[PDB]
C-alpha cells in the first residue's frame, strides 16, 4: 500500500517487552508504560522517581541510555498537575530511544537531573524560563531565553501570544522603554476545527 | 576560458592542478533556460476502480498507544545490541 | 562504514625526519599555500556587473506580489479568502461585498509586505491564479508605509508586470 | 470609471474617497493617491454576450488549467443571460 | 467631531488621540519634546521643515506608521504654510533663533513668520493656535530678541484672537542653551524644565478654557544668576555667544502674578535640583540658594 | 599571445564607435566589452549578449540616458528594465521579446515606470473601504 | 556664489556615497544574504562598500535579521556611537516590521521603533541582489542631499 | 493538604528568607544608582524596593513566598552582576507612561474599560 506507513511488529514487541522490564524493576515509581503505533516507548513515572529512574536507564547494562536527547515541558491547564515533564533519551549501545514523563504544578519543585545528565543544565533553565517550573538543586537556575526582568512564563497556554509589554526607543528619556502592548492590527483568531469527528479510533467514551 | 596559454600554464603550475578541466565559472555546458514542457506522471491512487479510500487511508489506521502496564524470565534490552561498524574499503584512512 | 580522518603514524626514518625538518625551517607548506592564492590572482573573477548584469533566476521565483486579471480585464480574485486563511504571517487582510453588477469581489485586499515571508502559499492556495508572487525584487522603499500594499497598488502591480507574469506562469503551470 | 470628488480626489473602483472634513487626506499632500484606472466592472461589461445552442454551457474562464474551476451555466430563462460566477462572461441560448 | 478624529484606544502609540497638529519649528529643542508627546498618544503630526530631511530623522520613531508627516515650507511663502495647516485642528508655532542671520533677523522669526502662520491658520479655519513667546518679552528691553518677542506676541493676539500664548522662562534640559551655555563658559532667574513646558503645551491643546489665554511657564524656584552659575560648575565637577544673548541672560525673570501658570494646566514644576545632573552629567570629565 | 590580447583591446575602442563612445560606456557602465545587440526597447535601453562569457555575464543592458522625463545618464536603476525584457535579462527564458513577444492585453501598462520611492509619485497607503457606521444627523430646524 | 555651494555639495555627496562603510548587525537569516553580497558574484567592495567596518568608522548600519526586545537596547547603543553622517538600512521583513514573528511577545515590531531608517529592503530574505539594489538606492539618496545649499540659506 | 515544600516548611521560615532578601536589596540600591548612573535618588530606589515587597504582603502560602523570593534573588543577581542594562533597571519606574485615570468619572470620559 504505497501511501500508508508500514508497521514494524518486531520493534513493537521489543519495546513492549522492555517496557515491562523497566516497570518490574522500578515498581516504586512507574505509573504507566505504553508503546505508540509508530513504536515509541513512554514510561510515565511519579515525580519522585526522576533521579532513580533516569539513573537506572543511564547506568543499567540492559539500558545504557547515555544521551539525553531533549528535556522539555508541556502545559495542559485542565490537569491538576498542568506541567508534563518529558525526557527523551537515546541508547547508542542498543540503538534505541525511550521517553520518560512525569508531572508537576506551579508550586511543586522537580529534582534537577544535572547529576544524571550534564546536558540537563540548560534544558531545565529553559523549562524554568518558559514554563516557570522550579528545579531543585540546580547549579544555576535562572532565565536563559527571555529578556532580563521579563515577567511571566511565555509558553504557558494562558500567556498571551503577544505578551503584555512592548519596547520602543523614547527620545525624552534617551533609552529603550517598555510600555503596555498595543497592536495596529490585532492577531486574527481563527476557528478552524471541523464539527465532524475525524478519528473514530480515538473517540473518548461519553 | 579566455585566459592565454601562458596564464593557463602559470596558474596551473602555481596551484599544482589542471584548473582548465574544472573551471569554477559556467559556460555553455549548463542547461538551456527554456525547456520543453513536462508531462508529469500520476500516483498509484489514480485509478477508476478497485480504489476505495477506506483501503488506502493511512490516518484511519493510526491507533492509540498500546498500554503494556498501568496503575489501574530473561532480561531484555530495548533492542538487540548494535553491531560493530566495518572500516571503509574505499579509503580506510585519510 | 567509517574511515579515520587523522590516524596516521609519521615515519621515523632519517630521510623522513629530515623532510619534516626542511618543512619546518624552509616553510615549504606555507609556500605551497602562497601558490594557491597566486593561481587565483590570475583566474577570471566571478563578479557580475550589476545593475547592467543580473543574477539568473527561474520562472518559479517568488518576488513582489500582484493581482491579476482575465483577458477581458475582469479581476480574477473572487474574495474566496483562501490566501488570507493559509497566509503563515497573517499578512493578508480582505473585505468583500457584492459589486454593483452583483459580482463577488473584494473591497479591501491588503498585503503588509513587512509581515510577509514571501513563501508563495497564497498563490498556491488561490483557485483562480488571482494573487501571484511576481518576478520583481527591486522595490525597496524609503519609508515603512510604502510597503503596506492595498488593492490599488496590487492591481497596478498586476497591470505593470502581467506581460512577464503570464509567461512565467506559462512555463511552470504544468509542474503545478 | 474613475471620477473625482468635489475636492478633486479621485474615487476608487471600490467607491472610496475621503470626504471634505477628513484630515486623513493630508497623507496625499505633496504625493499622490494610488488609483488603478482599469475598472474591472466596466471592462467586463464591454464583453459581448456569447450565443450558444444548448440549455447548459460550461465556462472555465479560458486557457483550460490557467482559468478558473469549470462550472456549468443554465440558460433556460430568456429574461436575462447566464453569467459565469467566476469570470463574468455572459451566455445566451440562441432562439 | 468628525468620525475620523474621535479618540480611541488606551492612549498609547497605536491609539487615536483625535489631535491633528502642525508643529512649526519641530526640528529644534522644544519641538522634539512636543512631537514626542504628541506621537506618544497617537496623534497625527504634520512637521513642516526648512532643513535637510537628514535633520528630521530623529522625529520618525516618535509616531506609529503614518502618524508623522513631513512637508517642505518656507517662512516667507504663505502657500507652503497653507498646505501644512489646512487639515489640522491645532497649530503650534515653535519657530525661533537665539541669534540673527544674514537672511533672518529677529523681526522675521519672531514677528513676520508668526504673524503669517497665525493669519493663514485663521483663514484655513484652524480652531486652536498655540504660540510660544517669552516671559521677559518687553518692547523696552535692551535685547532685540525680547523686543521682537513682544511685538510678535501682540500681533498674534490681534491676528488670531483665540490663540493660546505661552511665555516660558529660560528652559533647561539635555539640549538646552542654558545649563549647557554656562557649562561651556544682580540677576534673578526662574528657569523651567523642558518636560514641564512640553506638558503645559500638550494640556493647553486639550483644555478648552486655555483658548484666548496667556500663560507664563516658570520653575518652582528663583535663583541669583551668580548662585545658579556656581551650582552648575559644582554639578559639572568643574573648578569655579552674542551680545544679545548676554543681555537676555542678565535680564531678571519677570514676576507676572496675574497670568496663569503651569499649575493652571495641571503641571507640577520640576525643581532644577532634580534634573540638573541629567543635563550636566556629560559635562563631567550643594543645592543653590533660592530667593524666598 | 600578448600582441593578440592588445589588439582585442583596441578592437573594443572601434567596436564602441571610437574613443568617445568607448569612454562613455567605460564611465557609464565600468565595462568596455563589445557584444551582439539583441534588441532595444521603447525607452532606449539596449540589450546585448556574448555567449562566450561565463553564465551571468553573457547578457547585459546598457541603460537609456533618459526615461520618463528623468535624466539617467549617470543615475541608472535596475527597475528601469521593462517586464518584457526583465524575463530575458534575468535568464528566466532563452529568447528575447524580439523573437517571442509577450501576449498583448488592453490593461497592460504601455509605459513602464521605475521605482518611484522618494518622489511625489510614491505610493501612499490608505484604506480602500467605505465608512461602516453612519451617524444620525440632527434636524436643521429648531424644536426643543 | 550659489554655483560654488552647488558644486561642493556634489563633491562631498560624491565622496560620501562612493565610500559607504557599513556596519552589519548580522542578527539572523538575512545576515547570510549580506554575506552573499560581499561574496565574489556581487562583490560589494567594488562599489566602495568595504566588507566589514568597525562601528566607529562606519557610515551605514544594516539591520539584517530579527530584532528581539533583549537585543534592542544593544542595537540602539551601537547606533548612538556611530559618527555622523550615519544611515540605517533595514533589511528583511523581521527588521522592516517584525515579519513572521510580528505577533511575538519577544520581538520588536520593526527596527524603526528603535532607530530611524533610511531604506527598507523587502523580502524574507531579500536576495543579495535586492540588498545591493537597496544599497545603490541609499547612494542615490545621498546624492540628493543639499546640506551646504541649505546651510547657505539659513 | 500535604504538599512538597520548596524551601520553607512554614510561613515563619519563609518570612526569614523575605527579610534577608529585603536586606540584600536595600544595601544594593546605593551601588545600583552609582554603577548604572541612574537619575533617581537612593531614597527613590529604596522606596521602589519597599513598594515591590509591600504589594505581596497578603501572601500566606509559604510555597508562593518561596517562589517570590527565588524570583527576587534572580532579579538581584541580574542587577548586581550588571546583566541588566540601564533600561532594565528603570523599567520599575514607568517614566513614559502617563498616569491612567483611577476614579469612575475619568475612566468614563476616556473609554469603556472598567
Ligand atoms: C604587463 C602587461 C601584461 C598583460 O597585461 O597582458 C595580459 C595578458 C592576458 O592575460 P589573460 O589572463 O589571459 O586575460 C584574459 C584574456 O586573454 C584577455 O583578453 P581580452 O579579450 O579581455 O582583451 C581585451 C582587454 C585585454 O587587456 C589588454 O589589452 C591588456 C592591457 C594591459 C596593459 C598593461 O582589453 C582591455 O580591456 C583594455 C583595458 C585596459 C585595462 C587597464 C590596463 C592598463 C595597465 C597599465 C597601467 C598604466 C597606466 O597576459 C599575458 O599575455 C601573459 C604575459 C604578460 C606578462 C605577465
Ligand atoms: C579633490 C578633487 C577630487 C575631485 C573628485 C572628482 C570625482 C569625479 C566624479 O565625481 O565622478 C563622476 C560622477 C560619476 O557619476 P555617478 O557617481 O553618478 O555614477 C554613475 C556611474 N555608475 C552608474 C556606474 C555608478 O559624476 C557624478 O555623479 C556627478 C557628481 C560630480 C561630483 C564632482 C563635482 C566636481
Ligand atoms: C657551511 C655552514 C653554513 C652555516 C649557516 C647555515 C645556515 C642555513 C641553515 C639555517 C636555515 C634556517 C632558516 C631560518 C628561517 C627561520 C626558520 C624558522 O624559524 O622556522 C620555525 C618557525 C616555527 O615553526 P613551527 O612549525 O611553529 O615549529 C617550531 C617550534 N616548535 O616557522 C616560521 O617561522 C613560520 C613563519 C610564519 C609566517 C609565515 C608567513 C611567511 C610565509 C611566506 C614567506 C616567504 C619567505 C620570504 C623570503 C624573504 C623575502 C626577502
Ligand atoms: N529654549 C528656550 O530657552 C526658550 C525658547 N522659547 C521659544 O521657544 C521656541 C523654540 O525654542 P527652541 O526650540 O529652543 O528654538 P530652537 O532654535 O531650538 O528651534 C527653533 C526652530 O525654529 C526653526 N526656525 C528657525 N528659524 C527659522 C526660519 N527662518 N524659517 C523656518 N524655521 C525656522 C528651526 O528650524 P531649523 O532647524 O530649520 O533652523 C527650529 O526647528 C522659539 O520660539 C523660542 O524663542 C521661549 C522661551 C524660552
Ligand atoms: S507569500 Fe506567504 S507570507 Fe506573503 S502574503 Fe503570500 S502566503 Fe502570506
Ligand atoms: S487572491 Fe485568490 S485565494 Fe485570495 S481571495 Fe482572491 S481568489 Fe481567493
Ligand atoms: S526577514 Fe526572513 S530571512 Fe530575514 S531574519 Fe527574518 S525570517 Fe530570516
Ligand atoms: Zn468563467
PDB file of N, CA and C in Angstrom, chain A residues 1-4 12 14 16-18 21 23-24 31-35 37 62 65 92-94 96 198-199 201-202, chain B residues 44-45 55-71 73 75-82:
ATOM      1  N   UNK A   1       0.835  -1.194   0.000  1.00  0.00           N
ATOM      2  CA  UNK A   1       0.000   0.000   0.000  1.00  0.00           C
ATOM      3  C   UNK A   1       0.876   1.252   0.000  1.00  0.00           C
ATOM      4  N   UNK A   2       1.048   1.868  -1.171  1.00  0.00           N
ATOM      5  CA  UNK A   2       2.105   2.882  -1.312  1.00  0.00           C
ATOM      6  C   UNK A   2       1.990   4.068  -0.369  1.00  0.00           C
ATOM      7  N   UNK A   3       0.786   4.514  -0.022  1.00  0.00           N
ATOM      8  CA  UNK A   3       0.642   5.750   0.737  1.00  0.00           C
ATOM      9  C   UNK A   3       0.582   5.544   2.245  1.00  0.00           C
ATOM     10  N   UNK A   4       0.492   4.312   2.728  1.00  0.00           N
ATOM     11  CA  UNK A   4       0.337   4.041   4.150  1.00  0.00           C
ATOM     12  C   UNK A   4       1.695   3.682   4.735  1.00  0.00           C
ATOM     13  N   UNK A  12       7.838  -3.242  17.799  1.00  0.00           N
ATOM     14  CA  UNK A  12       6.757  -3.059  18.759  1.00  0.00           C
ATOM     15  C   UNK A  12       6.865  -4.053  19.907  1.00  0.00           C
ATOM     16  N   UNK A  14       9.663  -5.754  20.920  1.00  0.00           N
ATOM     17  CA  UNK A  14      10.866  -5.495  21.702  1.00  0.00           C
ATOM     18  C   UNK A  14      10.631  -4.370  22.697  1.00  0.00           C
ATOM     19  N   UNK A  16       7.749  -3.172  23.815  1.00  0.00           N
ATOM     20  CA  UNK A  16       6.777  -3.599  24.816  1.00  0.00           C
ATOM     21  C   UNK A  16       7.447  -4.443  25.888  1.00  0.00           C
ATOM     22  N   UNK A  17       8.297  -5.384  25.476  1.00  0.00           N
ATOM     23  CA  UNK A  17       8.982  -6.238  26.438  1.00  0.00           C
ATOM     24  C   UNK A  17       9.899  -5.428  27.343  1.00  0.00           C
ATOM     25  N   UNK A  18      10.648  -4.483  26.778  1.00  0.00           N
ATOM     26  CA  UNK A  18      11.492  -3.644  27.617  1.00  0.00           C
ATOM     27  C   UNK A  18      10.660  -2.748  28.523  1.00  0.00           C
ATOM     28  N   UNK A  21       9.930  -4.812  31.420  1.00  0.00           N
ATOM     29  CA  UNK A  21      11.195  -4.950  32.132  1.00  0.00           C
ATOM     30  C   UNK A  21      11.439  -3.761  33.052  1.00  0.00           C
ATOM     31  N   UNK A  23       9.272  -1.593  34.208  1.00  0.00           N
ATOM     32  CA  UNK A  23       8.241  -1.448  35.227  1.00  0.00           C
ATOM     33  C   UNK A  23       8.358  -2.511  36.311  1.00  0.00           C
ATOM     34  N   UNK A  24       8.865  -3.698  35.977  1.00  0.00           N
ATOM     35  CA  UNK A  24       9.099  -4.708  37.004  1.00  0.00           C
ATOM     36  C   UNK A  24      10.227  -4.292  37.935  1.00  0.00           C
ATOM     37  N   UNK A  31       4.205   4.492  36.874  1.00  0.00           N
ATOM     38  CA  UNK A  31       2.749   4.508  36.919  1.00  0.00           C
ATOM     39  C   UNK A  31       2.103   3.963  35.658  1.00  0.00           C
ATOM     40  N   UNK A  32       2.751   4.085  34.505  1.00  0.00           N
ATOM     41  CA  UNK A  32       2.158   3.629  33.258  1.00  0.00           C
ATOM     42  C   UNK A  32       3.254   3.451  32.222  1.00  0.00           C
ATOM     43  N   UNK A  33       3.095   2.440  31.374  1.00  0.00           N
ATOM     44  CA  UNK A  33       4.003   2.181  30.264  1.00  0.00           C
ATOM     45  C   UNK A  33       3.165   1.936  29.021  1.00  0.00           C
ATOM     46  N   UNK A  34       3.527   2.584  27.918  1.00  0.00           N
ATOM     47  CA  UNK A  34       2.785   2.416  26.681  1.00  0.00           C
ATOM     48  C   UNK A  34       3.726   2.528  25.495  1.00  0.00           C
ATOM     49  N   UNK A  35       3.358   1.858  24.409  1.00  0.00           N
ATOM     50  CA  UNK A  35       4.083   1.913  23.146  1.00  0.00           C
ATOM     51  C   UNK A  35       3.131   2.424  22.076  1.00  0.00           C
ATOM     52  N   UNK A  37       1.734   3.453  18.202  1.00  0.00           N
ATOM     53  CA  UNK A  37       1.592   2.676  16.975  1.00  0.00           C
ATOM     54  C   UNK A  37       2.745   2.901  16.005  1.00  0.00           C
ATOM     55  N   UNK A  62      21.388  -3.372  30.570  1.00  0.00           N
ATOM     56  CA  UNK A  62      20.404  -3.598  29.517  1.00  0.00           C
ATOM     57  C   UNK A  62      19.709  -2.323  29.067  1.00  0.00           C
ATOM     58  N   UNK A  65      21.164   4.185  28.333  1.00  0.00           N
ATOM     59  CA  UNK A  65      20.678   5.386  27.663  1.00  0.00           C
ATOM     60  C   UNK A  65      21.596   6.535  28.069  1.00  0.00           C
ATOM     61  N   UNK A  92      22.918   4.442  22.549  1.00  0.00           N
ATOM     62  CA  UNK A  92      23.719   4.093  21.382  1.00  0.00           C
ATOM     63  C   UNK A  92      24.018   2.602  21.354  1.00  0.00           C
ATOM     64  N   UNK A  93      24.207   1.997  22.527  1.00  0.00           N
ATOM     65  CA  UNK A  93      24.543   0.580  22.593  1.00  0.00           C
ATOM     66  C   UNK A  93      23.460  -0.271  21.951  1.00  0.00           C
ATOM     67  N   UNK A  94      22.201   0.022  22.253  1.00  0.00           N
ATOM     68  CA  UNK A  94      21.082  -0.755  21.748  1.00  0.00           C
ATOM     69  C   UNK A  94      20.320  -0.041  20.644  1.00  0.00           C
ATOM     70  N   UNK A  96      18.407   2.531  20.383  1.00  0.00           N
ATOM     71  CA  UNK A  96      17.017   2.639  20.797  1.00  0.00           C
ATOM     72  C   UNK A  96      16.786   3.957  21.515  1.00  0.00           C
ATOM     73  N   UNK A 198     -13.058  13.258  13.156  1.00  0.00           N
ATOM     74  CA  UNK A 198     -12.123  12.761  12.154  1.00  0.00           C
ATOM     75  C   UNK A 198     -11.692  11.323  12.425  1.00  0.00           C
ATOM     76  N   UNK A 199     -11.353  10.999  13.671  1.00  0.00           N
ATOM     77  CA  UNK A 199     -10.672   9.751  14.013  1.00  0.00           C
ATOM     78  C   UNK A 199     -11.506   8.955  15.007  1.00  0.00           C
ATOM     79  N   UNK A 201     -11.090   6.008  16.070  1.00  0.00           N
ATOM     80  CA  UNK A 201     -10.278   5.163  16.935  1.00  0.00           C
ATOM     81  C   UNK A 201      -9.920   5.844  18.246  1.00  0.00           C
ATOM     82  N   UNK A 202      -9.938   7.173  18.292  1.00  0.00           N
ATOM     83  CA  UNK A 202      -9.594   7.915  19.494  1.00  0.00           C
ATOM     84  C   UNK A 202     -10.808   8.490  20.208  1.00  0.00           C
TER      85      UNK A 202
ATOM     86  N   UNK B  44      -0.283   6.303  -7.607  1.00  0.00           N
ATOM     87  CA  UNK B  44      -0.946   4.996  -7.669  1.00  0.00           C
ATOM     88  C   UNK B  44      -2.415   5.017  -7.282  1.00  0.00           C
ATOM     89  N   UNK B  45      -2.929   6.128  -6.767  1.00  0.00           N
ATOM     90  CA  UNK B  45      -4.345   6.258  -6.459  1.00  0.00           C
ATOM     91  C   UNK B  45      -5.155   6.775  -7.639  1.00  0.00           C
ATOM     92  N   UNK B  55      -9.562   1.608   1.850  1.00  0.00           N
ATOM     93  CA  UNK B  55      -8.491   0.627   1.729  1.00  0.00           C
ATOM     94  C   UNK B  55      -7.105   1.256   1.634  1.00  0.00           C
ATOM     95  N   UNK B  56      -7.006   2.578   1.535  1.00  0.00           N
ATOM     96  CA  UNK B  56      -5.726   3.266   1.401  1.00  0.00           C
ATOM     97  C   UNK B  56      -5.699   4.513   2.275  1.00  0.00           C
ATOM     98  N   UNK B  57      -6.270   4.420   3.471  1.00  0.00           N
ATOM     99  CA  UNK B  57      -6.454   5.555   4.374  1.00  0.00           C
ATOM    100  C   UNK B  57      -5.496   5.386   5.552  1.00  0.00           C
ATOM    101  N   UNK B  58      -4.307   5.974   5.429  1.00  0.00           N
ATOM    102  CA  UNK B  58      -3.299   5.807   6.463  1.00  0.00           C
ATOM    103  C   UNK B  58      -3.704   6.410   7.794  1.00  0.00           C
ATOM    104  N   UNK B  59      -4.317   7.594   7.768  1.00  0.00           N
ATOM    105  CA  UNK B  59      -4.651   8.284   9.010  1.00  0.00           C
ATOM    106  C   UNK B  59      -5.605   7.463   9.865  1.00  0.00           C
ATOM    107  N   UNK B  60      -6.528   6.745   9.237  1.00  0.00           N
ATOM    108  CA  UNK B  60      -7.518   5.973   9.974  1.00  0.00           C
ATOM    109  C   UNK B  60      -6.986   4.632  10.457  1.00  0.00           C
ATOM    110  N   UNK B  61      -5.766   4.258  10.086  1.00  0.00           N
ATOM    111  CA  UNK B  61      -5.120   3.086  10.659  1.00  0.00           C
ATOM    112  C   UNK B  61      -4.277   3.413  11.881  1.00  0.00           C
ATOM    113  N   UNK B  62      -4.075   4.687  12.191  1.00  0.00           N
ATOM    114  CA  UNK B  62      -3.408   5.051  13.430  1.00  0.00           C
ATOM    115  C   UNK B  62      -4.269   4.646  14.618  1.00  0.00           C
ATOM    116  N   UNK B  63      -3.621   4.161  15.666  1.00  0.00           N
ATOM    117  CA  UNK B  63      -4.309   3.690  16.854  1.00  0.00           C
ATOM    118  C   UNK B  63      -3.744   4.383  18.082  1.00  0.00           C
ATOM    119  N   UNK B  64      -4.524   4.486  19.152  1.00  0.00           N
ATOM    120  CA  UNK B  64      -3.985   4.982  20.412  1.00  0.00           C
ATOM    121  C   UNK B  64      -2.879   4.074  20.919  1.00  0.00           C
ATOM    122  N   UNK B  65      -2.013   4.572  21.798  1.00  0.00           N
ATOM    123  CA  UNK B  65      -0.880   3.760  22.250  1.00  0.00           C
ATOM    124  C   UNK B  65      -1.330   2.486  22.946  1.00  0.00           C
ATOM    125  N   UNK B  66      -0.548   1.430  22.755  1.00  0.00           N
ATOM    126  CA  UNK B  66      -0.756   0.179  23.470  1.00  0.00           C
ATOM    127  C   UNK B  66      -0.231   0.323  24.891  1.00  0.00           C
ATOM    128  N   UNK B  67      -1.090   0.088  25.875  1.00  0.00           N
ATOM    129  CA  UNK B  67      -0.711   0.201  27.278  1.00  0.00           C
ATOM    130  C   UNK B  67      -0.218  -1.166  27.742  1.00  0.00           C
ATOM    131  N   UNK B  68       1.077  -1.266  28.038  1.00  0.00           N
ATOM    132  CA  UNK B  68       1.640  -2.532  28.490  1.00  0.00           C
ATOM    133  C   UNK B  68       1.593  -2.661  30.006  1.00  0.00           C
ATOM    134  N   UNK B  69       1.532  -1.551  30.731  1.00  0.00           N
ATOM    135  CA  UNK B  69       1.323  -1.591  32.167  1.00  0.00           C
ATOM    136  C   UNK B  69       0.650  -0.305  32.607  1.00  0.00           C
ATOM    137  N   UNK B  70      -0.273  -0.428  33.553  1.00  0.00           N
ATOM    138  CA  UNK B  70      -0.960   0.728  34.096  1.00  0.00           C
ATOM    139  C   UNK B  70      -1.195   0.501  35.578  1.00  0.00           C
ATOM    140  N   UNK B  71      -1.355   1.601  36.304  1.00  0.00           N
ATOM    141  CA  UNK B  71      -1.656   1.540  37.725  1.00  0.00           C
ATOM    142  C   UNK B  71      -3.141   1.372  37.998  1.00  0.00           C
ATOM    143  N   UNK B  73      12.116 -15.549  34.010  1.00  0.00           N
ATOM    144  CA  UNK B  73      12.109 -14.544  32.956  1.00  0.00           C
ATOM    145  C   UNK B  73      13.518 -14.095  32.612  1.00  0.00           C
ATOM    146  N   UNK B  75      16.192 -11.375  31.165  1.00  0.00           N
ATOM    147  CA  UNK B  75      16.352  -9.940  30.999  1.00  0.00           C
ATOM    148  C   UNK B  75      16.338  -9.585  29.518  1.00  0.00           C
ATOM    149  N   UNK B  76      15.855  -8.384  29.214  1.00  0.00           N
ATOM    150  CA  UNK B  76      15.786  -7.895  27.845  1.00  0.00           C
ATOM    151  C   UNK B  76      16.410  -6.511  27.779  1.00  0.00           C
ATOM    152  N   UNK B  77      16.892  -6.163  26.601  1.00  0.00           N
ATOM    153  CA  UNK B  77      17.333  -4.825  26.262  1.00  0.00           C
ATOM    154  C   UNK B  77      16.315  -4.192  25.327  1.00  0.00           C
ATOM    155  N   UNK B  78      16.314  -2.866  25.185  1.00  0.00           N
ATOM    156  CA  UNK B  78      15.291  -2.243  24.327  1.00  0.00           C
ATOM    157  C   UNK B  78      15.333  -2.745  22.899  1.00  0.00           C
ATOM    158  N   UNK B  79      16.503  -3.149  22.428  1.00  0.00           N
ATOM    159  CA  UNK B  79      16.670  -3.776  21.126  1.00  0.00           C
ATOM    160  C   UNK B  79      17.959  -4.579  21.173  1.00  0.00           C
ATOM    161  N   UNK B  80      18.218  -5.416  20.170  1.00  0.00           N
ATOM    162  CA  UNK B  80      19.469  -6.164  20.165  1.00  0.00           C
ATOM    163  C   UNK B  80      20.651  -5.219  20.124  1.00  0.00           C
ATOM    164  N   UNK B  81      21.775  -5.595  20.733  1.00  0.00           N
ATOM    165  CA  UNK B  81      22.927  -4.689  20.752  1.00  0.00           C
ATOM    166  C   UNK B  81      23.373  -4.332  19.344  1.00  0.00           C
ATOM    167  N   UNK B  82      23.786  -3.078  19.172  1.00  0.00           N
ATOM    168  CA  UNK B  82      24.168  -2.596  17.853  1.00  0.00           C
ATOM    169  C   UNK B  82      25.425  -3.316  17.387  1.00  0.00           C
TER     170      UNK B  82
END
